[PDB]
Enzyme design. Structure first.
Site, PDB file in Angstrom:
ATOM      1  CG  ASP A  80      -2.302   0.624   0.983  1.00 14.42           C
ATOM      2  OD1 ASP A  80      -2.302   1.871   0.753  1.00 14.42           O
ATOM      3  OD2 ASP A  80      -3.414  -0.038   0.988  1.00 14.42           O
TER       4      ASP A  80
ATOM      5  CG  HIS B 235      -5.412   3.836   0.732  1.00 16.80           C
ATOM      6  ND1 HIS B 235      -4.816   2.610   0.516  1.00 16.80           N
ATOM      7  CD2 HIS B 235      -6.703   3.704   0.338  1.00 16.80           C
ATOM      8  CE1 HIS B 235      -5.711   1.777   0.009  1.00 16.80           C
ATOM      9  NE2 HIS B 235      -6.862   2.415  -0.117  1.00 16.80           N
TER      10      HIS B 235
ATOM     11  CB  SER C 242      -9.445   0.563   0.034  1.00 15.01           C
ATOM     12  OG  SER C 242      -8.731   0.756  -1.161  1.00 15.01           O
TER      13      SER C 242
END
Ligand SMILES: [Ca+2]
Ligand code: NA
Lengths: 281, 64
Positions: A32, A64, A221
């Site tokens: 990520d 994120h 996600s």
């Protein structure tokens, strides 16, 4: 005081916690944008960066990867949120830059790092519309090597009778995860198709954000790390189970929702997955 | 409410931004290369524009 985000309760992770199982000694790579290792509600065990201009995997300039990490493994303590697998060994494998994007070779290099460093689980809350032979080869190699590989299904919603699951979720060796809300309704953006495998909460998911913050994000996600965290709980209770077995245990014990094109096998249920005998509820 | 712009595929990134900002003035626009891998969060305020090496739109822009 710590809060338990609704999605952690919805997949029945607290049932595993009450049995004494929290993902201890299970290595999970969050592939990520990095993970903010300074956050007091996370413990990062290790990691590596594949992003040529951002060499520190413990600095997350996007936010994120840190949010995804907190759903996997935010610590069990008196602050913040609680993760699905709060004792997991969490690895920051940075393959996305600040802008949220990475080259295929960076993602592949991260998957290779995870294989070489004996990760038990990979989460990839990431995707693109096209595959490549090298990308398929990397995920297939990870699975052949014993790693449970979980990815977001994609946020493309519906397109008639066409599949809209993206890669690497769309590869058979990867568990593709779609998103539901707290009522078990598919999120309108959740990708669809025969490659959709299971669903997990992906609407208004509270988790850790960089600079010691928390916040609610949406997306497949957010659904994917519930399943990666569930895999780590299952392995902490059954440390000899193979990835094949972990995958089947999650698939075989879902709560069936609608048609499989839209919902796959339904909502994961980690309590049921971590029993010896599996059936759907 | 317009949330996809299939008519912008093959246009310049400049014309795409102008059109999207007429339809959605508060849009948070980001330009990225087509053929990359990206985060899978959903942001109602965002419109990502995926461009080819000539800076033309190479994928249908949508909110998310
Ligand atoms: Ca906590
Ligand atoms: Na798949």
């Amino acid at each position: 005081a710590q809060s338990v985000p609704y999605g952690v309760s919805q997949i029945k992770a607290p049932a595993l916690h009450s049995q004494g199982y929290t993902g201890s000694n299970v290595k999970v790579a969050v592939i990520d944008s990095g993970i903010d290792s300074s956050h007091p509600d996370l413990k990062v065990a290790g990691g590596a960066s594949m992003v040529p201009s951002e060499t520190n995997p413990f600095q997350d300039n996007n936010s994120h990867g840190t949010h995804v990490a907190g759903t996997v493994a935010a610590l069990n303590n008196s602050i913040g949120v609680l993760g699905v697998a709060p004792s997991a060994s969490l690895y920051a494998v940075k393959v996305l830059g600040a802008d949220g994007s990475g080259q295929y070779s960076w993602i592949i290099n991260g998957i290779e790092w995870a294989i070489a460093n004996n990760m038990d689980v990979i989460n990839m809350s990431l995707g693109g519309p096209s595959g490549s032979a090298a990308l398929k080869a990397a995920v297939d190699k990870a699975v052949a090597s014993g790693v449970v590989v979980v990815a977001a299904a994609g946020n493309e919603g519906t397109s008639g009778s066409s599949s809209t699951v993206g890669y690497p979720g769309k590869y058979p060796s990867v568990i593709a995860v779609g998103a539901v809300d707290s009522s078990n309704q598919r999120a309108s953006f959740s990708s669809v198709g025969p490659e959709l495998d299971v669903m997990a909460p992906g609407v208004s998911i509270q988790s850790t954000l960089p600079g010691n913050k928390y916040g609610a994000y949406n997306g497949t996600s957010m659904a994917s790390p519930h399943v990666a965290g569930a895999a780590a709980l299952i392995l902490s209770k059954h440390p000899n189970w193979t990835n094949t077995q972990v995958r089947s245990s999650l698939e075989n014990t879902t709560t069936k929702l609608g048609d499989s094109f839209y919902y796959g096998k339904g909502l994961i249920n980690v309590q049921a997955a971590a029993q010896h005998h599996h059936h759907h509820h | 409410m317009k949330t996809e712009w299939p008519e912008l595929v093959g246009k310049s990134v400049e014309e795409a931004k102008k059109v999207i900002l007429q339809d959605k003035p508060a849009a948070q626009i980001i330009v990225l290369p087509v053929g990359t891998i990206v985060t899978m969060e959903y942001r109602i305020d965002r419109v990502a524009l995926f461009v080819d090496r000539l800076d033309n739109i190479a994928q249908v822009p949508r909110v998310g």
